[PDB]
Symmetry: C4
Subunit: 198 residues, 4 copies
Amino acid sequence: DSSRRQYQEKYKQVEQYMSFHKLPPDTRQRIHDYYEHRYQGKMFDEESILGELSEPLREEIINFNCRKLVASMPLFANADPNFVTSMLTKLRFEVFQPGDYIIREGTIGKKMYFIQHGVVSVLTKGNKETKLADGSYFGEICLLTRGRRTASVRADTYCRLYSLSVDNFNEVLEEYPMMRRAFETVALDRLDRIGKKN
Amino acid sequence: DSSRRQYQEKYKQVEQYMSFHKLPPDTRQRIHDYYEHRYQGKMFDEESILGELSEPLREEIINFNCRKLVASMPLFANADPNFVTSMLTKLRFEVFQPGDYIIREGTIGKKMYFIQHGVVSVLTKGNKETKLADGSYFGEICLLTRGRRTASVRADTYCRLYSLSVDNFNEVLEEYPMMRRAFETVALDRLDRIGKKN
Amino acid sequence: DSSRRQYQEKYKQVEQYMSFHKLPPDTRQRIHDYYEHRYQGKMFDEESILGELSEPLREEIINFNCRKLVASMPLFANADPNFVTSMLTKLRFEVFQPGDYIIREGTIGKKMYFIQHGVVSVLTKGNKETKLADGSYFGEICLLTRGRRTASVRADTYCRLYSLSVDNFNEVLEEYPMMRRAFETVALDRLDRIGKKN
Amino acid sequence: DSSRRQYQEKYKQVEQYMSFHKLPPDTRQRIHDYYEHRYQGKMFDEESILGELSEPLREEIINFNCRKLVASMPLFANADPNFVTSMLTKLRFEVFQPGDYIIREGTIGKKMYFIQHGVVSVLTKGNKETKLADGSYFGEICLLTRGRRTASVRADTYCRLYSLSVDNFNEVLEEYPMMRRAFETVALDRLDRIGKKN
Ligand SMILES: Nc1ncnc2c1ncn2[C@@H]1O[C@@H]2COP(=O)(O)O[C@H]2[C@H]1O
Ligand SMILES: Nc1ncnc2c1ncn2[C@@H]1O[C@@H]2COP(=O)(O)O[C@H]2[C@H]1O
Ligand SMILES: Nc1ncnc2c1ncn2[C@@H]1O[C@@H]2COP(=O)(O)O[C@H]2[C@H]1O
Ligand SMILES: Nc1ncnc2c1ncn2[C@@H]1O[C@@H]2COP(=O)(O)O[C@H]2[C@H]1O
């Protein structure tokens, strides 16, 4: 109940932020609904709490939190738990509201994404390529080629995603060189379909 | 009303800071008036609040906050919204009181500035060169030559400025190489008028 | 008594974290018992408190806190107090619960550990090699070879350990080049027993 | 009066820190007296307060706080105010209690010190070389040679010092190359007296 109060006080603080900056009506609605979807009536200082815990405890916890995502994904469910735990500890939780652009085509990608829950459209030049949903990942291509985004990725629904930076991706694959190929197969496949060796 | 209280408590904390360090009369006045002009009776932990929001929400917000500045400036109003949003997300809000030196001639510039509101004198050797106001930028020269300031820039009034570091400037122009020329035209023009290829 | 309250409030915050993420029964028990063993009914913002103190005061304090560990260890008890204080100021306190994996074989080691109190099994390929306890260190090998872990190290009991990063290890040994050999003797000895020049 | 309360609450927090870690009698006394000498019954979040202020306001403030030190020192009192303000903004306040070792001979120096108030003994091999007091600086030698401390420096009294890191020292002297010589004259002089070109 102090974490429900936390959320309430922090929301009243947001309300005032929005009044002061005279934020427009679509963005106040969006912010209101973002708070409810992500935090759900409670707030915690996750990284403070987790900060006070031991390494193995942070890793039981994150292994539990991403339990279903792990199982969704042959890359994880079939891998050495030490590697999954390595990658998992580097993921950042992000929520996106419907219609949001996650990745914009032709930008410099420094980030990759795994879908816990949601549907995503992959788009090039305003044209639908496929959709991706729970147990898919995207944005891997730029982590490997180290160049420009080959497609746009828009949230079609609310989306619970975990992001993984380019530096964190390489640190893990240095430690687990055998895992690199699996990403490469997927990114070659996708590069075939959209017709690129740029 | 908790953000008005925040400002009040933080101001009483400032008052005590000033008594303890026996701060002189011109600087207590200045500080008093700085608080009122920048914060306006309210305080928020902007970056905490924004921190809790999604990327796209931070970008609606900053696009809204710099809405008029964008429109003031052909560099922005005529550009690809993705680039404007890129640059915008890297800007830092600074306020300067009349008579303040923003840039001192012959220093190493690591920073550039866009004027939301205010008037600025550009000066060399104690001599007025021009004034700049709402919808101008300055300090771009050192971001490009990577050397010494070619003029002083003083605030003639209260000034709402957004600063952009040299590293952030280059990160964006790497992503948007086509935007570099527009800065270069302006900085060549200005280098002509004050007679430098140093 | 405000530090006992601190612990209590932060524990109620943890309880709620655990309910919200529907944490499983073995991990709630573990977390409960971790809090009691590490913090003992009190919490302090150590690094805030220490932050307000002078350097020499931080160093009396840490020299006192690791007083018995120093005396346990010929590397410290026989060394120049300036070097011990150098190393000591770089140590991080970690607690591990029984059965926890401190180091996993074949990972990239960036960290070394000194035992204040506890027993540890050193393991290769699921086979017991030795145990280490109060006044031992481990993980030094990867700090010197800059490669892969040559054994697993599991906590057999509760364990009060101090960790020392690879960068911090080298910064100190640059300042105290004469101390390098002592680690090298130990790591050569251990590399002999498990049969590696990898 | 909320800053006097701040100090009181933070001191009760310290008291508990000391009881819990069963800190010894000389170090509790020292800590008690350190708090009283440095903070004087009040505490402020200086860098939070200063953080909310503009650059020019931070620089009036620090120019005022180090007003007498500036005037004490030909290096400052005779220099371009822009350079003094550059250096000043990079200084960190440190207090040392009598008998404290500020610099230990033969360590790697990354830091230099200016005396606001106090007396210091400079020592080599346990032998007094000179004393330094208000308006002196020391530790400059290692900032220039980038090697080992040529003497020990002990606080003989309470000492209000401002420290300046090696990186900050070079950043300023890059911007103000003309100021380098003045340090060099002093460090050559001192290297003569203690007989070093090491
Ligand atoms: N044909 C496709 N099918 C599924 N996903 C794709 C396809 N084309 C591109 N992507 C994803 O869209 C992402 C856009 O960012 P990247 O180019 O870094 O990596 C891309 C892939 O992860
Ligand atoms: N003649 C001018 N007209 C307008 N602005 C100028 C002129 N000369 C210099 N400036 C600006 O003053 C700034 C001082 O810092 P910079 O040299 O980095 O870049 C300079 C320009 O942005
Ligand atoms: N035979 C052994 N006896 C004691 N400790 C060992 C032995 N073999 C390995 N270790 C320790 O186990 C550690 C595993 O990590 P490192 O390879 O970095 O360094 C290793 C040593 O510190
Ligand atoms: N003879 C001396 N007189 C005054 N100060 C000295 C003398 N010798 C050394 N020092 C100072 O003592 C400092 C010890 O650290 P450094 O060698 O970096 O720089 C040294 C000088 O700042």
